[PDB]
Design a protein around this ligand. Structure first.
Ligand SMILES: N[C@@H](Cc1c[nH]c[nH+]1)C(=O)O
Ligand SMILES: N[C@@H](Cc1c[nH]c[nH+]1)C(=O)O
Lengths: 238, 238
């Protein structure tokens, strides 16, 4: 029905969306979004932190009740779980050293190591369009160990969403020497064009009330205020 | 400039204008009306919670920049803060238990304890019109503690505004044994004709602007849309 305590699973390795801080506290625009969605439907929310590859199964095991983890909405994920309406747009791009040639293409990526987070939409674009053409796909848990292997030379490109790379790495002094290398690779039916909150297919009423609550947060100006402490561009798109 | 982020003070204990849900979300007609005014004014206002007898000092100490708290536009208060245009009408009535007397005569209040919210217009009238006359005026800090002491028999009448009493108490199942009653009590100087946002006299540009935004929420229909979430009659007047 509408559960009185909902357990939201998150992977806390993805700034600015969800990440831990000095005071250990969970922090980020997806965290802020869910806190506000929860008050608004008026129920107690607790966050469970797990790796992103474990969330979509924990949900089907009722170990958690929602997923908020910048989880992009895609045709394939949707033939297993349900999602709210679009919370904001996502785009994928590879990050490269400023001194590395590396392309969105089997050409200059041939025989290079691209790192992807396990469970993600770009781990699966990397296996279907890119490993057969000879570029090696290295999967990780913890988005922060991918950026850390990139700056150490261990991998040659880091593959993930644009705004997290941008805000969480390239605008930080550790990504000063790095850059996006190439466009966003285009695959609308694999990547999806936005993220949402993941929910079981059978919970139609907790899904309907989250959609209403979010709708309202976009119309009274609460979304624009929550977005503005992280972004100076329009995160939502349209 | 014109301020980017405005502090708004509210006492959130005055259903149906401002109150909180179990999760702390500020809810009510005054909350809706502020947020649409902020959006149209293109400003980022935030709500600070404070007992209404603190709100006019807080705005003098530049800790808040606005008051939205069902504050009556009066001439006594017009001598030290400025107000916006009339947001909606306000009337004062006493709330009394069924038949149990304290009836339409000032003499029937002699020796009875009349509960009032501290800092209010009814408090100011109580001690001018009625406390010289042998009636006991008891001031409280949250409107909810005036209705629970009425119920418990610890005071004999509760004096606050008419729509708040009726929609927050009399039409709720705790208010079933109660009614309006007591002498008709008027003083146009002390009481409003209605309510406005209260601000500093110094910040005149915000008023022209909030005034403008309000004016157009009203020809456009967003006022009527917000009011019908709450009232089945004209809250504005005519
Ligand atoms: N939006 C992408 C990437 C990602 C989500 N969370 C962490 N990384 C996905 O859902 O797979
Ligand atoms: N309108 C009345 C009563 C009140 C407003 N808020 C709480 N009580 C006043 O301004 O005093």
């Amino acid at each position: 029905a509408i559960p009185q305590k909902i357990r939201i699973g998150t992977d806390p390795t993805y700034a600015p969306f969800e990440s831990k801080n000095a005071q250990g506290e969970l922090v980020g625009f997806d965290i802020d979004l869910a806190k506000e969605l929860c008050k608004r439907i008026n129920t107690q929310c607790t966050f469970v932190e797990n790796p992103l590859d474990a969330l979509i199964p924990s949900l089907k095991a009722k170990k958690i009740d929602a997923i908020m983890s910048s989880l992009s909405i895609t045709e394939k994920r949707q033939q297993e779980i349900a999602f709210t309406d679009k919370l904001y747009a996502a785009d994928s791009r590879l990050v490269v050293a400023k001194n590395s040639d590396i392309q969105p293409t089997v050409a200059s990526l041939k025989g290079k190591r691209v790192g992807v987070l396990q469970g993600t939409t770009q781990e699966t674009f990397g296996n279907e369009h890119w490993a057969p053409k000879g570029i090696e796909i290295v999967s990780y848990q913890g988005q922060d160990n991918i950026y850390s292997d990139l700056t150490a030379g261990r991998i040659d490109a880091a593959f993930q969403d644009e705004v997290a790379a941008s805000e969480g790495f390239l605008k930080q002094p550790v990504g000063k020497d790095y850059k996006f290398g190439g466009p966003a690779v285009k695959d609308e039916k694999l990547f999806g064009v936005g993220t949402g909150m993941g929910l079981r297919k059978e919970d139609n009423e907790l899904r309907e009330a989250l959609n209403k609550a979010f709708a309202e947060m976009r119309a009274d100006g609460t979304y624009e205020k929550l977005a503005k402490k992280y972004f100076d561009f329009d995160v939502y798109g349209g």
